[PDB]
Structure 1
Amino acid sequence: NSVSVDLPGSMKVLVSKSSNADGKYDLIATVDALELSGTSDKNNGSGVLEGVKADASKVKLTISDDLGQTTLEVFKSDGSTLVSKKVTSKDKIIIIIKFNEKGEVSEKIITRADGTRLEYTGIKSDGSGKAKEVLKGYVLEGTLTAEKTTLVVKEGTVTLSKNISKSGEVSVELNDTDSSAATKKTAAWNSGTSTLTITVNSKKTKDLVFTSSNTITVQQYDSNGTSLEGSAVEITKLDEIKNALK
């Protein structure tokens, strides 16, 4: 009989073994106890399924033709206005959006394949909101504008700002209001290696690397201020970022 097909987003769909009079395949799925059904032009589990929640909300599951992406949408009872939209893409990133009563984006949570997250909440009509990055072991907090996300850590008179542009590019800056020339931190960002180099009293002191694995590492320079020493240590807690800023 029907064929079970594995789907992105931790779902299954059953597709009929054979097509109907019109050449179309029947689809059924159950998602958290809700039964969905549909028909498809294809025989592989792709297509659209629909159902209706107990509270009359409409639900649609759309499975891309190559099975790489699923979209699970919930609408108000007439089916016109979105309430939520979950997309699991072929790179296994999950994006879940919640909408306000008008169907405008109000929250967006991005879960990367490694489990780290970007959380955007209280989003307003200008694309501003609150931002958090949830990393392994700690969380960074800040704000969203239509230009960039800025996540901030403060220690003493130092403010570290991690920026994520609208297009996803990471850059980092450091600003210190310390009135002592002997202790004031400055830093330079190297986009080529995603590394922030901190200087104090005209010598390099540390490299902070913002890795492609969504981690931060810290490594010290020798007293010469020119060669790195030892080996980089991965940050495990927000307290350790603050330590690097001392």
Structure 2
Amino acid sequence: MKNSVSVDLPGSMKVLVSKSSNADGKYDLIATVDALELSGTSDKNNGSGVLEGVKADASKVKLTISDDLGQTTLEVFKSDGSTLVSKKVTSKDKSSTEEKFNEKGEVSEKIITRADGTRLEYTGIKSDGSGKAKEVLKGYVLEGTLTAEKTTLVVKEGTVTLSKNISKSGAVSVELNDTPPPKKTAAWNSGTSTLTITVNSKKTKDLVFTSSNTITVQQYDSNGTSLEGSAVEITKLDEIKNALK
């Protein structure tokens, strides 16, 4: 710090590495990270090495810098120092991986940043690999979910589901499902001159064709077993068409 050299780092950080060595050959590293003074003695005079620090709430902070000034590995622990909370790995080339762990020392969440600026954001992860997913792309977002084998991001339009699957090892594969909406059916009763229309095991309408040469609609209650209202006579084509929706 005193008369030393400023080194820029992956992820908008600096370190100050001492101009000269110490008693045991080391170089002094000081970095203000987040807002803590972090400190450490390193074999090398470039910026590489570990820096440690303690938050005012007694959480332990450990910043590792990779030998080639490539990779800053920012770990946060619980007060004991044994129990990992969070971990931001940044890479040389602008890409980062913000993790989070749970009570058990198991990964809860994961924000992946990509070199371009696009993101994979996993949350609510569970013991059996599964959880939410978001993909931040340039201009728009693909939501989805996670499993042990794969991420699946989905986009829907009416009867079409587009499904972008990203495998564990990076492999994209895409698929499409068009599935028709539930269709009307009907049954004719010759006895009563009544068409009863069934949608998805729910009766919906009675269309009745009278000896008086006219047509009457009545609606099934949303139970789909008893009629409701009273019988509405038809007065032009349009109404018959309406009943068929």
Q: Quote the offset at 1:91 in angstroms.
A: 2.9
| Residues 1:172 and 2:199 are matched in the alignment | no
Q: Quote the offset at 1:137 in angstroms.
A: 1.8
| Residues 1:196 and 2:195 are matched in the alignment | yes
1:238 and 1:99, CA in 2 relative to 1: closer, same or farther beyond 3 A? farther
Q: What aligned pairs does 1:73-222 form with structure 2 within 5 A after superposition? A: 73-92=75-94, 98-177=100-179
Q: Quote the offset at 1:230 in angstroms.
A: 56
1:230 and 1:83, CA in 2 relative to 1: closer, same or farther beyond 3 A? farther
Q: Quote the offset at 1:9 in angstroms.
A: 1.0
1:158 and 1:25, CA in 2 relative to 1: closer, same or farther beyond 3 A? same
Percent identity, aligned pairs only, is 100
SS at match of 1:45: coil
SS at match of 1:43: coil
Q: Quote the offset at 1:54 in angstroms.
A: 1.0
SS at match of 1:244: helix
Cα deviations by residue, 1:39-58 (Å, 9 ceiling, x for unpaired): 11111010000000011000
Q: Quote the offset at 1:90 in angstroms.
A: 2.4
**Which range moved further: 69-78 or 234-243?**
234-243
Structure 2 partner of 1:229: 228
1:60 and 1:147, CA in 2 relative to 1: closer, same or farther beyond 3 A? same
SS at match of 1:105: strand
Q: Which runs of 5+ in 2 are unaligned?
A: 95-99
Q: Quote the offset at 1:126 in angstroms.
A: 1.7
Cα deviations by residue, 1:3-33 (Å, 9 ceiling, x for unpaired): 0000001100001111112111110000122
Q: Is the 8 A contact 1:198 1:205 kept in 2?
A: yes
Q: Quote the offset at 1:117 in angstroms.
A: 0.7
Q: Quote the offset at 1:190 in angstroms.
A: 53
- Structure number with greater Rg is 2
**2: CA distance, partners of 1:145 / 1:161:** 14
Instruction: Kindly indicate whether structure 1 or structure 2 has the higher relative contact order, using CA contacts under 8 Å at least 6 residues apart.
Output: 1
Q: Quote the offset at 1:157 in angstroms.
A: 1.0
1:151 and 1:112, CA in 2 relative to 1: closer, same or farther beyond 3 A? same
1:128 and 1:36, CA in 2 relative to 1: closer, same or farther beyond 3 A? same
Cα deviations by residue, 1:58-77 (Å, 9 ceiling, x for unpaired): 00100000000001010000
Cα deviations by residue, 1:113-147 (Å, 9 ceiling, x for unpaired): 22211000001112211111011221111110110
Structure 2 partner of 1:45: 47
Q: Quote the offset at 1:213 in angstroms.
A: 69
Task: Give TM-score, length-normalised by structure 2.
Answer: 0.69
**2: CA distance, partners of 1:113 / 1:211:** 72
Q: Quote the offset at 1:156 in angstroms.
A: 1.5
**Which range moved further: 202-211 or 122-131?**
202-211
SS at match of 1:217: strand
Q: Quote the offset at 1:245 in angstroms.
A: 26
Q: Is the 8 A contact 1:155 1:242 kept in 2?
A: no
**2: CA distance, partners of 1:211 / 1:3:** 97
Cα deviations by residue, 1:146-175 (Å, 9 ceiling, x for unpaired): 101000111121110001000111111111
Q: Quote the offset at 1:238 in angstroms.
A: 39
SS at match of 1:84: strand
Q: Quote the offset at 1:103 in angstroms.
A: 2.3
Q: Quote the offset at 1:237 in angstroms.
A: 43
**1: CA distance, partners of 2:192 / 2:67:** 38
Query: How well do the aligned residues superpose, as a CA RMSD in angstroms?
Result: 17.8
**2: CA distance, partners of 1:14 / 1:34:** 14
SS at match of 2:242: helix
Across the two proteins, how many residue pairs are aligned to each other? 235
Q: Quote the offset at 1:208 in angstroms.
A: 45
Q: Is the 8 A contact 1:174 1:186 kept in 2?
A: no
Q: Is the 8 A contact 1:138 1:236 kept in 2?
A: no
1:202 and 1:211, CA in 2 relative to 1: closer, same or farther beyond 3 A? same
Structure 2 partner of 1:17: 19
Cα deviations by residue, 1:71-120 (Å, 9 ceiling, x for unpaired): 1010000100111000001232xxxxx11122210010011122211000
